[PDB]
Each structure stands twice: as C-alpha cells, then as structure tokens.
Design an enzyme around this catalytic site. Structure first.
Site, PDB file in Angstrom:
ATOM      1  N   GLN A 105       0.809  -1.470  -0.009  1.00  0.00           N
ATOM      2  CA  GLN A 105       0.270  -0.085   0.228  1.00  0.00           C
ATOM      3  C   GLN A 105       0.900   1.168   0.442  1.00  0.00           C
ATOM      4  O   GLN A 105       1.389   1.600   0.794  1.00  0.00           O
ATOM      5  CB  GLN A 105      -1.464  -0.063   0.912  1.00  0.00           C
ATOM      6  CG  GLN A 105      -1.570   1.098   1.218  1.00  0.00           C
ATOM      7  CD  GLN A 105      -2.708   1.097   2.041  1.00  0.00           C
ATOM      8  OE1 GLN A 105      -2.065   1.759   4.039  1.00  0.00           O
ATOM      9  NE2 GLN A 105      -4.728   1.307   1.899  1.00  0.00           N
ATOM     10  N   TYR A 145      -5.247  10.991   3.598  1.00  0.00           N
ATOM     11  CA  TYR A 145      -3.918  11.276   4.040  1.00  0.00           C
ATOM     12  C   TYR A 145      -4.187  12.140   2.030  1.00  0.00           C
ATOM     13  O   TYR A 145      -4.964  12.844   2.050  1.00  0.00           O
ATOM     14  CB  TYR A 145      -2.772   9.702   3.307  1.00  0.00           C
ATOM     15  CG  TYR A 145      -3.469   9.224   5.589  1.00  0.00           C
ATOM     16  CD1 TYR A 145      -2.402  10.284   6.031  1.00  0.00           C
ATOM     17  CD2 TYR A 145      -4.177   8.127   5.145  1.00  0.00           C
ATOM     18  CE1 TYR A 145      -2.979   9.812   7.368  1.00  0.00           C
ATOM     19  CE2 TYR A 145      -3.799   7.748   6.560  1.00  0.00           C
ATOM     20  CZ  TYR A 145      -3.285   8.333   7.635  1.00  0.00           C
ATOM     21  OH  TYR A 145      -3.541   8.083   8.967  1.00  0.00           O
ATOM     22  N   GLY A 153      -9.824  -5.890   8.859  1.00  0.00           N
ATOM     23  CA  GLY A 153      -8.620  -5.177   9.982  1.00  0.00           C
ATOM     24  C   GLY A 153      -9.004  -6.395  10.741  1.00  0.00           C
ATOM     25  O   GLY A 153      -7.810  -6.923  11.690  1.00  0.00           O
TER      26      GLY A 153
END
Ligand SMILES: Cc1cc2nc3c(=O)[nH]c(=O)nc-3n(C[C@H](O)[C@H](O)[C@H](O)COP(=O)(O)O)c2cc1C
Ligand SMILES: Cc1c([N+](=O)[O-])cc([N+](=O)[O-])cc1[N+](=O)[O-]
Length: 349
Positions: free
Chosen positions: A97, A177, A307
């Site tokens: 990622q 981000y 997750g």
C-alpha cells in the site's frame, strides 16, 4: 458466491475472497526498514486471499507515525524482499500500500519541516501517538512543481515495490491522507491544475495511478478509498459525484480493484462506486462472516477485507470456515512495539 470461493484480481488467482485489510502496526526497524518480525507476522496471515500491506510511505516527507516502513530506498527494498519471499513461500499473495500522509503529520517526523498538503488548512485534533499531546501544524501548501515531484516519488515507490517482489501495489487514496486531501473540496482550495474543479481535484490520484500502471500494468494495481469522508477531518461538497467520478476514471484504466473503507449503512455509496468502476469491488469496515457473505450473495461486493479480526486472528479464514470462536483484539497493542499483540495471537487448536 461466498467468502470461500476463489476470485481473480487481474491475472492473480486468489484462493478465497477473505482479504487482509491494510493495517499500520509500527513494527519496523529504525530507518523505517521492514524486518523479520514483520515477515513473521505476514507469514502467519498468508492464508488470506490477498494481503494488503500496512501503509508504506513513498518519501521521507510522507511519514507521520513512528516506526512505519518506507519504500523509497534500497535498504527498505531489501527488507521488503524478505517479507514477500516469506509470504510467497507460505503460499500467500501481497500488495504494497503506497502512502503519503500529507498534512496528517508533525514536524518531529520531518526534521522540523512542515507537513505538505494541497492547501494550508490545519486538520483538527491531536497527532496520534505523539506525546505530549500536540495539535497538528498548519501544513505548507505545495508548489505545482512539487506535486510533480510527488508523482515521481510514487512512481519510484511503485518501481521499488516491484523490485521487492510484491504481487502488486494499492494506491492509498483514503482516510484523509495526501491523495484524499487533494480529492476533496474542503481540503483543496488550489487554483492550479490540481484544484478548483472535480477533474482537477482527482488529477493527482489519477497521475499517481497512471505512474503505477506504467510500472505494473493496471491489472496489478488497486486503489483504496474512504467514500464517507469520515476520518482525519475530511469533507467534500458532493461526495457521490466525487467518488463516482474517481470510480469511473479508475474503471476506464482497467485497474484490478477498488477497496473502500465504508461500513454498510443507508447512505453507503459503495454501490454507485462499484457500478461506475465495473471491476472487482472489495468492501470493508465492520463486516463479519454473515454480513460479508450477505454482501457477496447480493452482488454488493466481490470480496471483503477484514482489519481488526485479522490483527487478532492470523488464521481468520480457517476460523470463518469453521464458525470458530475468534480471538479478542487488544487495541492497546495495535501500535507500539515488538511481538506482543503482533505475532502472539494464537491459531486454532
Ligand atoms: C490499527 C489499525 C491500523 C490501520 N492501518 C491502516 C492503513 O495503514 N491503511 C489503511 O488504508 N487503513 C488502515 N486501517 C483501517 C483498516 O484498513 C480498516 O479499514 C478498518 O480497520 C475497518 O475494517 P475492520 O472493521 O474490518 O477492522 C487501520 C486500522 C487499524 C485499526
Ligand atoms: C478510521 C481510520 C483512520 N482515522 O484515524 O481516521 C485512519 C486510518 N489509517 O489509514 O491510518 C484508517 C482508519 N480506518 O480505516 O478505520
């Protein structure tokens, strides 16, 4: 279709549709170098249909947390090569990622420099992990030329990931981000080619995606999105429009998948994104076996990323297959240091 049926993403055959979500864990060696502890952790989880790695910064100016890995230098490449070789030997698959935190950082990580962003707009709240508690700085708005430099850092990062033996890369376009900061109207007040229209706001994400495509082929590139704009002080004036435009443009490029952090609710725009995109859609956020299988059966998803359950359950796929109990996750060790709460969650007996 269930979680246990194989799926192809591009030309990569996965054995199931149980995806390990990207998870920052802060276990890298000094210099942001992947290590044997990380290799062990990923190997434990190699039964995942695909592992999406922890967010990995493409440049020193794109870090905002302690002990998170990079992909900009040879030392980091060598460290990641040890991880991917081990995952592969364990029968797994893994994408890196690619990250740049943009404004979500603190000068202490940047040798005193300001975090960079599309616009000089201070994010609310306190920097995570930093102690004593500190506000975020107001970031420095990038010069147009510097944005091209960032595209080159992503290109180099994608090249480095390929040298490190990954199966693909996922572009981190999510969670407030850098790329998400450019994408959304509240955080991008630019008036150059990178702001001031939807086409312009999506431009950076698409230029980075195109750079990755040149290195990898689109069918080995995925993109991560957060269409509810609910983390890190985000906000967009028309997110249905913004995210479906992105979905359409990514689909035109034939990218391997979109993975969206977006729990199911009446306002989920995932179905619009999936339809505009046309390729494999990976849902995520608060899914369990039942709701994941329901989403696959209803055509709302092609795979499901987990997750927290993968943090706590290295053999999540086997546990799901067996309707077995799941280990309880310990959030106090999600970040922080060393093997405790990282490689010591047990497998089924
Ligand atoms: C400790 C932790 C670290 C995470 N790190 C990342 C990350 O590096 N990149 C990313 O895109 N999402 C990250 N996330 C978000 C997860 O990928 C995922 O979206 C989220 O945990 C919701 O899915 P879940 O309910 O299945 O856990 C992280 C989440 C947690 C709890
Ligand atoms: C909720 C969330 C994040 N956050 O704090 O707003 C940050 C994440 N990240 O990529 O660092 C991920 C998050 N998530 O998916 O839950």
């Amino acid at each position: 279709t269930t979680l246990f049926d194989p799926i192809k993403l591009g030309d990569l055959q996965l054995p199931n549709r149980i995806i390990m979500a990207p998870l920052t864990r802060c276990r890298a060696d000094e210099g942001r170098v992947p290590n044997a502890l990380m290799a062990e952790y990923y190997v434990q989880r190699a039964s995942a249909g695909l592992i999406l790695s922890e967010a990995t910064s493409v440049s020193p100016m794109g870090v905002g947390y302690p002990d998170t890995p990079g992909i900009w230098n040879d030392e980091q490449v060598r460290g990641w090569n040890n991880v991917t070789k081990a995952v592969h030997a364990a029968g797994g698959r893994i994408f890196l990622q690619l990250w740049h935190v943009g404004r979500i950082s603190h000068p202490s990580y940047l040798n005193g420099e300001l975090p960079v962003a599309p616009s000089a707009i201070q994010p609310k709240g306190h920097v995570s992990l930093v102690r004593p508690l500190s506000d975020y700085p107001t970031p420095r708005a990038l010069e147009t030329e510097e944005i091209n430099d960032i595209v080159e850092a992503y290109r180099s990062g994608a090249e480095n990931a390929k040298a490190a033996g990954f199966d693909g890369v996922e572009i981190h376009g999510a969670n407030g981000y850098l790329l998400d900061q450019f994408l959304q109207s509240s955080t991008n007040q630019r008036t150059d080619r990178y702001g001031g229209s939807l086409e312009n706001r999506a431009r950076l994400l698409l230029e980075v995606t195109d750079a990755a495509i040149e290195v990898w082929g689109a069918q080995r590139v995925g993109v991560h999105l957060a269409p509810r704009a609910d983390a890190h002080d985000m906000g967009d004036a028309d997110r249905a429009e913004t995210f479906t435009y992105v979905a359409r443009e990514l689909g035109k490029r034939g990218i391997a998948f979109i993975c969206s952090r977006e729990r199911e609710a009446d306002d989920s725009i995932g179905p619009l994104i999936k339809e505009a995109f046309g390729g494999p859609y990976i849902v995520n956020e608060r899914f369990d076996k039942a709701s994941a299988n329901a989403a696959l059966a209803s055509g709302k998803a092609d795979a499901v990323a987990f997750g927290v359950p993968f943090i706590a359950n290295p053999d999540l796929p086997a546990r799901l297959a067996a309707d077995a109990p799941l280990n309880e996750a310990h959030p106090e060790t999600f970040y922080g240091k060393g093997p405790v709460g990282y490689i010591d969650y047990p497998r089924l007996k």
